[PDB]
Write an enzyme that holds these catalytic residues in place. Sequence first.
Site, PDB file in Angstrom:
ATOM      1  CG  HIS A 111      -1.803   1.227   1.258  1.00 39.62           C
ATOM      2  ND1 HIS A 111      -2.709   1.545   0.413  1.00 39.62           N
ATOM      3  CD2 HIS A 111      -1.440   2.342   2.202  1.00 39.62           C
ATOM      4  CE1 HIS A 111      -3.289   2.834   0.436  1.00 39.62           C
ATOM      5  NE2 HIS A 111      -2.273   3.245   1.592  1.00 39.62           N
ATOM      6  CG  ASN A 143      -3.209   6.633  -0.124  1.00 45.99           C
ATOM      7  OD1 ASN A 143      -4.076   5.969  -0.082  1.00 45.99           O
ATOM      8  ND2 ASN A 143      -2.339   7.129   1.025  1.00 45.99           N
TER       9      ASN A 143
END
Lengths: 389, 389
Positions: free
Chosen positions: B303, B336
């Site tokens: 991530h 993101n």
Amino acid sequence: MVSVSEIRKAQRAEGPATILAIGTANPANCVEQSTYPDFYFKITNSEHKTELKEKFQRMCDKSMIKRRYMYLTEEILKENPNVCEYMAPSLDARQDMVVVEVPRLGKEAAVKAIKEWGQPKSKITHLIVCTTSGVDMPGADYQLTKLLGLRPYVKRYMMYQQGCFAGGTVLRLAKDLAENNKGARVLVVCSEVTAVTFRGPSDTHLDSLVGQALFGDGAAALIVGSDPVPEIEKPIFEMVWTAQTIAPDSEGAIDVHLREAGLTFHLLKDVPGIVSKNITKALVEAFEPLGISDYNSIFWIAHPGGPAILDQVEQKLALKPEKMNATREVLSEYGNMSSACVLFILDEMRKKSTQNGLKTTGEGLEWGVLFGFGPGLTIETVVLRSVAI
Amino acid sequence: MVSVSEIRKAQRAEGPATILAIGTANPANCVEQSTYPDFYFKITNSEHKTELKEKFQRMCDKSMIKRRYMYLTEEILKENPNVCEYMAPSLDARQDMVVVEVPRLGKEAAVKAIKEWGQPKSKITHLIVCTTSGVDMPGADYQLTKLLGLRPYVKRYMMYQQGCFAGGTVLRLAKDLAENNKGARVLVVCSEVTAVTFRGPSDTHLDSLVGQALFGDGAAALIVGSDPVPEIEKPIFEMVWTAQTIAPDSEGAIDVHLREAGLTFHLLKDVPGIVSKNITKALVEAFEPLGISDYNSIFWIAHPGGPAILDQVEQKLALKPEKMNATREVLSEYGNMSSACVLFILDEMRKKSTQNGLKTTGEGLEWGVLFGFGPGLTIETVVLRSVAI
């Protein structure tokens, strides 16, 4: 080189997911339903709305609720006038109450379930936390991990803003977690606090008003696992099959929004009618494969959304009046605790069956059904098998 | 009479949960990063905050993001000045946007995944919907069921207010659903929209400001199932093992609260440092059982919370620069996107591997790892196996 089929075989459990412990808890403040209309209309500065108060009195008299446990007290409400109005900006104040109270009450119930289970809390591998009251990051799952001293590598499932059918949802989820993972022991916690829904009365919003007569606070915790250790762990109920469905012609029946004024409950259709019209299809899906057609031959757990759902299901199916006894006892003693109710009913049923010397935890019967009802209109079904003694 | 062991054996799947399709989607409004400081300081009425704009320009310059897709536009922001302030009551306006946009964007990604899968949407048995952007009852899971025309009896898992690690969480959940249920096909949808977190800049809240340089919108959808039908369904990746843990000494690292002013992002500790200090432990748990200790020999999905997490993990483990290529390409092109990000990275990896004729979908390597990082500090680990071709 590495065999995934070998890993998969070694990683999974063998038997059915089993409820091995149940613990419950409620706020200390006990609120009698007989004096609720007066308390509620006074604390919301609505005593001059005589006709609306009479409508609320009838809602309370028809509720079949004797008392409820509330985190909200007269003192707390006097410090929060925005919460006492029908519609005032108050989510921050409500969130500040429930971000702490949800895990507080959940810990009380979880410590009781862990005590009954009797095994080390370090063997809890999965944690499911479910609430319809408040949201936060890290969530209530992280807070309960900290408060209970669970391992930091517990696998968490944070079920937020679920609604009243989610007692069934957490059982459906726990079943897969326990059955797919050898050794897994799942701590399940439903914890519901009405501080985000409490609000003053409005004569143009009678749907919102009914919630004020029915919702109460409570938490329930379970330990669920497959392959119980004989004579060490003690099975209470086994899960065998689950389903979830959306009833036809039910759009907008129960719509609940999280807004700046808190959680607002809107009702649009005949919920008792929809539930009773669709329950038989849910029973034949679940029980036809088991060769069971007599719905009085199984034990029953139904989410007590209101008494009319219970009455209409009983009448539709020709259930003996005693079938809903445990369900109605929990409604009478605690009101509608949303997701937690069906878990309180499981505890009531197994305790009464034991106390009264019946042969199984499901009122002396082998097979049983648990139903959750809530927004969508959603119906959750869990087929259970009882355990001897 | 009834054999539960027979039922259990007939009810479960045999093989590892497999990703069978991936589809993604983003809002049409493309926002270039190069000129974002000017756009953002103008729309938030903060152009006179010269030094603060300088700090934001540096954050955007170091972000390693070229562009983001955002539902929010200049017109929508001009109609919502409370969202343009750092801290003004605005949750109702933000919820009105995201309660619709989350399922809309999710629908577009789901339709793409279902088209790739090629099988009837009546075969979808389970639906997982995850978002950190708004909450409602019935949830986005109900909305997607309705929008896609899934069966009303699809078994739903509504994952609200999850956070940035939940790309891992949904995979961890889908793995158990698929593996424990014969024939189950799980539609997994992560859909993230920055309308609940967008806010204006404050020179005493630089941790909030960092988020305005990084967060972007996107939805990703997967089909997950065990026992793929050979040559009809097409495996992309297999899941083999999962974990979730809370890093030590990380309390309060990322706290995110849903208040009357929307979702507020805070940062209290060094996230890149905590992740890089704890990643080795996570790798050893996952890979020591497989006999793998060379972390350059597996494919990687991380991530991309920010570029510093990636850089510090790379430096800590001595990863070759190319290991993070797919991860950094997604960060570059989309920013993101919270839970959806890791699923976009799986898509990029398998598409580039297949396009370029590598031997497997995991960059020509056999084993891989996917990590989610977010509040708690939580680390999600999923061990994957690639597929030949």
